[PDB]
Amino acid sequence: MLGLKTSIIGRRVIYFQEITSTNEFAKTSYLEEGTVIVADKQTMGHGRLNRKWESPEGGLWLSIVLSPKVPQKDLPKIVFLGAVGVVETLKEFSIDGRIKWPNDVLVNYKAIAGVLVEGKGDKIVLGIGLNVNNKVPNGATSMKLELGSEVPLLSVFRSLITNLDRLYLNFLKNPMDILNLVRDNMILGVRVKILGDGSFEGIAEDIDDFGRLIIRLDSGEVKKVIYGDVSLRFL
Amino acid sequence: MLGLKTSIIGRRVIYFQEITSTNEFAKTSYLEEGTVIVADKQTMGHGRESPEGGLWLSIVLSPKVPQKDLPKIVFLGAVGVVETLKEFSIDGRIKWPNDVLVNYKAIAGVLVEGKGDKIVLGIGLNVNNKVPNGATSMKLELGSEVPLLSVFRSLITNLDRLYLNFLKNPMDILNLVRDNMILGVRVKILGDGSFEGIAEDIDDFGRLIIRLDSGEVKKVIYGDVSLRFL
């Protein structure tokens, strides 16, 4: 009854009024490639770094089962597929989202969406959390807060799934293309701090061919970050 | 994302761009009660292709009621459809025991399957799809396309309410059927042979009461029997 015309992503959609986590269900259930898991609310949702991500009613909480027969090295680009997809959708609703490496989407520096990718050997789970009409944590934002009015969740869903299906299909053939899209929509040229042991500061210059964040320290040293906790030093 | 507010029917919904049969998938798969299986089209639909534009769905049920009441499940589907059609100002009427007609043309059919502790309620409703001759659709009746999703929301809400009351009082549905069924007309019953008579009413068991011209009263139980209007 949804009438989705996508090729792979969206051939099947499993909707829940409530669920612990769309990513968990997607990981533990055998599901055809392209199956989308979506729920009105998550009771135990979380983003990367195991950070508890509130998933109240009004938001778009979904996971997508993928099985991209591509080199084990391109798997890390799946996150970017989700982030670029969100950005393209936000644009369609006249909202300018920018990517905070590696998986966050911000608007005027406020978090509006997060992407959580989890591999499992037999498949890859692309999780996306987007603040639409739900109440958000202080410092965060939503499509509702940005546009000053409630947005039809299904309209956002339709838009996102369509963009992701398109991005995914091209990715299966031209895997490197996504990196350029990411660069054009990522927050760069700003000072950032990588947290944890061996913490350091520098300018986030770009992402390389593997998607690593290239940081230029004040000493001139160049470091390539694969993953971690990032903080904008002047925002 | 659908924001359904139902108690049981619709707690989960599995949508398919295409599927062989929503009823077959629901019967075969391990699914929780209330799960709705819906598809844009069925390539192998059937009753006792369903083209894009129609509403093709199946509901998994596990009613904890007497085995005798189980045969009443088909009526829940038929009444739910009638209620939804009335919400869209379409006069749906029930043709015993599983069909819904509008001006004597088929607009929807109900197929219930399942033996013990797992019942599948299948419903096919013509909304915006092309239909065979003799049949009709909500689009043909209203003169314009109808938001398929709106029809889905309406139907699921109606079925959930009807199903909850059915768990409490399995006989309540019979009154709704009676008020919305085509009666007082001559019909032909086809089964172990055939006979004609006036469809007078349905009894306390949902059996169709037929009065033959001889005055004889026959009570028809649905299963392997077909009804034709004269």
Side-chain angles (χ1 to χ4, degrees), chain B residues 3 55-56 85 128 149 182:
Chain B
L55 185 58
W56 322 116
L85 289 175
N128 303 310
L149 176 62
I182 300 172

CSV table of all heavy atoms in Angstrom, one decimal, chain B residues 3 55-56 85 128 149 182:
chain,number,residue,atom,x,y,z
B,3,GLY,N,2.8,5.7,12.8
B,3,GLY,CA,2.1,6.2,14.0
B,3,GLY,C,0.7,5.6,14.2
B,3,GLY,O,-0.2,6.3,14.6
B,55,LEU,N,-6.0,-2.7,-2.2
B,55,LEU,CA,-5.5,-2.9,-0.8
B,55,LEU,C,-5.6,-4.4,-0.6
B,55,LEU,O,-6.6,-5.0,-0.5
B,55,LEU,CB,-6.4,-2.2,0.2
B,55,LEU,CG,-6.0,-2.2,1.6
B,55,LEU,CD1,-4.6,-1.6,1.7
B,55,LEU,CD2,-7.0,-1.4,2.5
B,56,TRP,N,-4.4,-5.0,-0.6
B,56,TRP,CA,-4.2,-6.4,-0.4
B,56,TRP,C,-3.5,-6.7,1.0
B,56,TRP,O,-2.3,-6.4,1.1
B,56,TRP,CB,-3.3,-7.0,-1.5
B,56,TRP,CG,-3.7,-6.4,-2.8
B,56,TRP,CD1,-2.8,-5.6,-3.6
B,56,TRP,CD2,-4.9,-6.4,-3.5
B,56,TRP,NE1,-3.5,-5.2,-4.8
B,56,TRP,CE2,-4.8,-5.7,-4.7
B,56,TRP,CE3,-6.2,-7.0,-3.2
B,56,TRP,CZ2,-5.9,-5.5,-5.6
B,56,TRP,CZ3,-7.2,-6.8,-4.1
B,56,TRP,CH2,-7.1,-6.1,-5.3
B,85,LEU,N,-15.8,1.7,4.1
B,85,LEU,CA,-16.4,2.2,2.9
B,85,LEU,C,-17.4,3.3,3.2
B,85,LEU,O,-17.5,4.3,2.5
B,85,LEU,CB,-17.1,1.1,2.1
B,85,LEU,CG,-16.2,0.1,1.4
B,85,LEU,CD1,-17.0,-1.1,0.8
B,85,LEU,CD2,-15.4,0.8,0.4
B,128,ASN,N,-8.0,1.8,-6.2
B,128,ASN,CA,-7.6,2.5,-7.4
B,128,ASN,C,-7.2,1.6,-8.5
B,128,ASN,O,-6.9,2.1,-9.6
B,128,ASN,CB,-6.5,3.5,-7.2
B,128,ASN,CG,-6.8,4.5,-6.0
B,128,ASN,OD1,-7.8,5.1,-6.0
B,128,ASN,ND2,-5.8,4.6,-5.1
B,149,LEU,N,-3.2,4.8,1.5
B,149,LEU,CA,-2.8,4.8,2.9
B,149,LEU,C,-4.0,5.2,3.8
B,149,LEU,O,-4.1,4.6,4.9
B,149,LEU,CB,-1.6,5.7,3.1
B,149,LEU,CG,-1.2,5.9,4.5
B,149,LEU,CD1,-0.7,4.5,5.1
B,149,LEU,CD2,0.0,6.9,4.6
B,182,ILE,N,-27.1,-8.1,2.6
B,182,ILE,CA,-28.1,-8.1,1.6
B,182,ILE,C,-29.1,-9.2,2.0
B,182,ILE,O,-28.7,-10.4,2.0
B,182,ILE,CB,-27.6,-8.4,0.2
B,182,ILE,CG1,-26.6,-7.3,-0.2
B,182,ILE,CG2,-28.7,-8.4,-0.8
B,182,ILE,CD1,-25.8,-7.5,-1.5
